[PDB]
Amino acid sequence: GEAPNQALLRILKETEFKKIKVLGSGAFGTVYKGLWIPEGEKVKIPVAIKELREATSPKANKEILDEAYVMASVDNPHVCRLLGICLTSTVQLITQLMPFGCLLDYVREHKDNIGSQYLLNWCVQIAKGMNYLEDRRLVHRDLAARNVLVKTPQHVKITDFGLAKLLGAEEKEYHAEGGKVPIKWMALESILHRIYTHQSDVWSYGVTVWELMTFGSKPYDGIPASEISSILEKGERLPQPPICTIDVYMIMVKCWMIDADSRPKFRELIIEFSKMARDPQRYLVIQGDERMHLPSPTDSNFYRALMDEEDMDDVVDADEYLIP
Numbered sequence: 001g002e003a004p005n006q007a008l009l010r011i012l013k014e015t016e017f018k019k020i021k022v023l024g025s026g027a028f029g030t031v032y033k034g035l036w037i038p039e040g041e042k043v044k045i046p047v048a049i050k051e052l053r054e055a056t057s058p059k060a061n062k063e064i065l066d067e068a069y070v071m072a073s074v075d076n077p078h079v080c081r082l083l084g085i086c087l088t089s090t091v092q093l094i095t096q097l098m099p100f101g102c103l104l105d106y107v108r109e110h111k112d113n114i115g116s117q118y119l120l121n122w123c124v125q126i127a128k129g130m131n132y133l134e135d136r137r138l139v140h141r142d143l144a145a146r147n148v149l150v151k152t153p154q155h156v157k158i159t160d161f162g163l164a165k166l167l168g169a170e171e172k173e174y175h176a177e178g179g180k181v182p183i184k185w186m187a188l189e190s191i192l193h194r195i196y197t198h199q200s201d202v203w204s205y206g207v208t209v210w211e212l213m214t215f216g217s218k219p220y221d222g223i224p225a226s227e228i229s230s231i232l233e234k235g236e237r238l239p240q241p242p243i244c245t246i247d248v249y250m251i252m253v254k255c256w257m258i259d260a261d262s263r264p265k266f267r268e269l270i271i272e273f274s275k276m277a278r279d280p281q282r283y284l285v286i287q288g289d290e291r292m293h294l295p296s297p298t299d300s301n302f303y304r305a306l307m308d309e310e311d312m313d314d315v316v317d318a319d320e321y322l323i324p
Ligand SMILES: C=CC(=O)N1CC[C@@H](Oc2cc3c(Nc4ccc(F)c(Cl)c4)ncnc3cc2OC)C1
Pocket: 023, 024, 025, 026, 028, 029, 030, 031, 047, 048, 049, 050, 067, 071, 093, 094, 095, 096, 097, 098, 099, 100, 101, 102, 149, 159, 160
């Protein structure tokens, strides 16, 4: 009827996680960094760990296990996958640590060192990620630069599947209802009719690319969310970022067409951004571009800027830790 989801959900003992330190907190809950030392392995795996506030709110464990389901069912170089869960007082999600954090913050804090080649490569990688999600019939529904993580400056991955939805073997639109929504990243049809498709995700990709190309500007800044559907109906759109050629901005604009089926396919975005990445200074115009550098895996205090030296002997990235 539809293919069986044979993903493994790994239950991980609390006694295998060490050096637990806070990365951030809020409504979403708390995320920590830590090490995961599977027992009798001789590996230490850098991890992030997401928990909500309290063992209560049966709603909350439902939401987070919904997220776990989705994160366990993906496997792609440009998507974050679940390593497992920990069943404590609270339900904790465990995943590969992405040490440079979220891309929104990254572009903000490193504006002066981000050249054309990085921007376009990110665009390619996010498109690969999103294409993979489409092939697996998932609609993310919250693609935003905040929901893209940086493993290294060269390697980003989509995360935050807490709003993602599958689609039946012959179903096209998800129809949602209520709940707080990222209105500024949403297709018009999603705001108006709570319709959500692969093509509504393309809209969100457009906005995400705008965020990167403006070094993390806030879209429709100062506009109240309640006014967005009108702005859009009138035909207004996010403006051309200074660094963008018409070539790049046109792609953005095509992502924001009213006719969903007229928007680009992720497979097409991969191709276009890939072509652009072979000659980046032809497509993005950044002052002092050719002379920028960001941390690479082949640098000294790359592995020392994260780790304790006590640990480093047996550290293995989650991307190199695979199980039967
Ligand atoms: C409250 C959050 C917050 O404000 N921020 C903002 C900074 C961000 O910092 C990191 C988060 C990481 C992460 N997140 C994650 C997502 C879904 C999951 F299901 C799980 Cl298990 C984790 N994954 C991996 N690496 C992360 C690294 C981060 O910063 C170094 C959290």
